[PDB]
Amino acid sequence: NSILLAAVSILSACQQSYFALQVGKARLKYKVTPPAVTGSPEFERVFRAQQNCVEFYPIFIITLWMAGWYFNQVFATCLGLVYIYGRHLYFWGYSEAAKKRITGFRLSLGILALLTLLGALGIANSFLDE
Amino acid sequence: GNSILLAAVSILSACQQSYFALQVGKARLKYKVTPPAVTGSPEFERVFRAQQNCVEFYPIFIITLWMAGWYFNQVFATCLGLVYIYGRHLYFWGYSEAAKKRITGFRLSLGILALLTLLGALGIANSFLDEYLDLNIAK
Amino acid sequence: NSILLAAVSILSACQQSYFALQVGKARLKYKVTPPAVTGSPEFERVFRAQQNCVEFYPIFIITLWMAGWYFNQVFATCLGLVYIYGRHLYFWGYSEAAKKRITGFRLSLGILALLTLLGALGIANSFLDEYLDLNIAKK
Ligand SMILES: CCCCCCCC/C=C\CCCCCCCC(=O)OC[C@H](O)CO
Ligand SMILES: N[C@@H](CCC(=O)N[C@@H](CS)C(=O)NCC(=O)O)C(=O)O
Ligand SMILES: N[C@@H](CCC(=O)N[C@@H](CS)C(=O)NCC(=O)O)C(=O)O
């Protein structure tokens, strides 16, 4: 069983594709011609927000699966849901103003350290039984 | 094991990505762009942006590829996987010659990514209704 | 029986987060206010190095697991550790001067390449097991 992990993962991949879509409409609304990524200030906020998310994505996925596999799938899955929401706050907050990114950011960084902690314990815990 | 095809596509796609990184490295030398800068030459700037768009989407493609292959069909996911790799080849070399000649390869690889997403969502769903609610769409 | 892969994977994730933190400390120290990523030579080097690392991360993870799953987990694990070390040289090297990034860059692309090779052999050998040929005949 990894079905809960599997659901959360497909969920998050849809959010990441959505964010990429938001940048695509921002190019048109603020007339920023590829390959440029600068000019309009709110475009730079949208672009930078989507970039920070897309960077951290594989890191969320790995910690998510290690925790779910070596600690508990249901608990990890729940944390996973919380992360997806924190990233929803981060993205939309930042789009409006750089200081509105702060809540969603702290939320998503909290979950991530926890996931790391849980995955690290279960992996450790698992090897002392051997 | 019953993932041997997925593993093969993954390794192929990973080689294409390292290949894209090599071109950026060679473009840096051809147009004399001093690191860590990434602007100055229009032809460099198109190559950099192209590799950037590919390298962003890579983990999304991988998750979508494996979820399709595990919960829907390894052979169908595997075949789409190859075409996606092909589309990104068009996108990259397309964008490199002109900003607007990236579009065919762009629509191809994204169309495919969505189909794979669809399949992954169905199979995961089907497996979920059969494992916590005892309902299979089997008929 | 993927316990070693899991461990290396958690180490590398911590490494990546530590790098992200450096960019954050650099933002405060050289006054680069978000969403800007230019404006200070020392920041731009730290930023660019961290960007190269996080982009290459999923490529390393896939390659690590295909090798570890289809060839040998202990050997893939060891290569994984040396790669994490190469990225350590690369990042701090680049932070001091763009031209001190080259050793760690070479070590880690060397490793990635070895991992890509081993995974390809292992998948091949493993594919022949549904053709019933196993090169346990070379063992
Ligand atoms: C000494 C620690 C062992 C490092 C090897 C395993 C790497 C794993 C941890 C962090 C990634 C890189 C950051 C390392 C943080 C400790 C080293 C440091 O802070 O400075 C290094 C020096 O300034 C320039 O070589
Ligand atoms: N700081 C430069 C050089 C970094 C580096 O070590 N390798 C570069 C080119 S020399 C690379 O392979 N980049 C792939 C990419 O980021 O596009 C950059 O990121 O463009
Ligand atoms: N992966 C991040 C790590 C650095 C980081 O955490 N930056 C914080 C600054 S506290 C951020 O969210 N910056 C907003 C932005 O990049 O636009 C990056 O390279 O930007």
Author numbering:
A (entry chain C): 4 to 133
B (entry chain B): 3 to 141
C (entry chain A): 4 to 142
From the paper:
Microsomal glutathione S-transferase 2 (MGST2) is a member of a family of integral membrane proteins denoted MAPEG (Membrane Associated Proteins in Eicosanoid and Glutathione metabolism), which encompasses several important targets for development of anti-inflammatory and anti-cancer drugs interfering with prostaglandin and leukotriene biosynthesis.
The structure of apo-MGST2 (with two homo-trimers in the asymmetric unit) shows structural heterogeneity, while the structure of holo-MGST2, which contains GSH at only two of the three possible active sites appears more rigid. In the holo structure, only one of the GSH molecules is observed in full occupancy, with the other refined to 72%. The binding conformation of GSH as well as those of associated interactions with active site residues differs markedly between these two sites, suggesting that only the GSH at full occupancy is bound productively. The GSH at full occupancy observed in the holo complex adopts a “crescent”-shaped binding mode, similar to what has been reported for LTC4 synthase10,11 and mPGES-112, while contrasting to the extended conformation described for MGST1. This GSH has an opposite head to tail orientation with its γ-glutamyl amino group hydrogen bonded to Tyr97 instead of Glu58 as for the GSH at full occupancy. Furthermore, the salt bridge between Arg51 and the glycyl carboxylate of GSH is lost at the partially occupied site, which contributes to its inefficient binding. In the holo–GSH complex, however, this region adopts a loop conformation with relatively high B-factor within the unoccupied active site. This transition from 310 helix to loop makes the essential Arg104 more flexible, which is reflected in poor electron density compared with GSH-bound sites. In contrast, in the holo state, the productively bound GSH interacts tightly within the active site, which globally rigidifies MGST2.
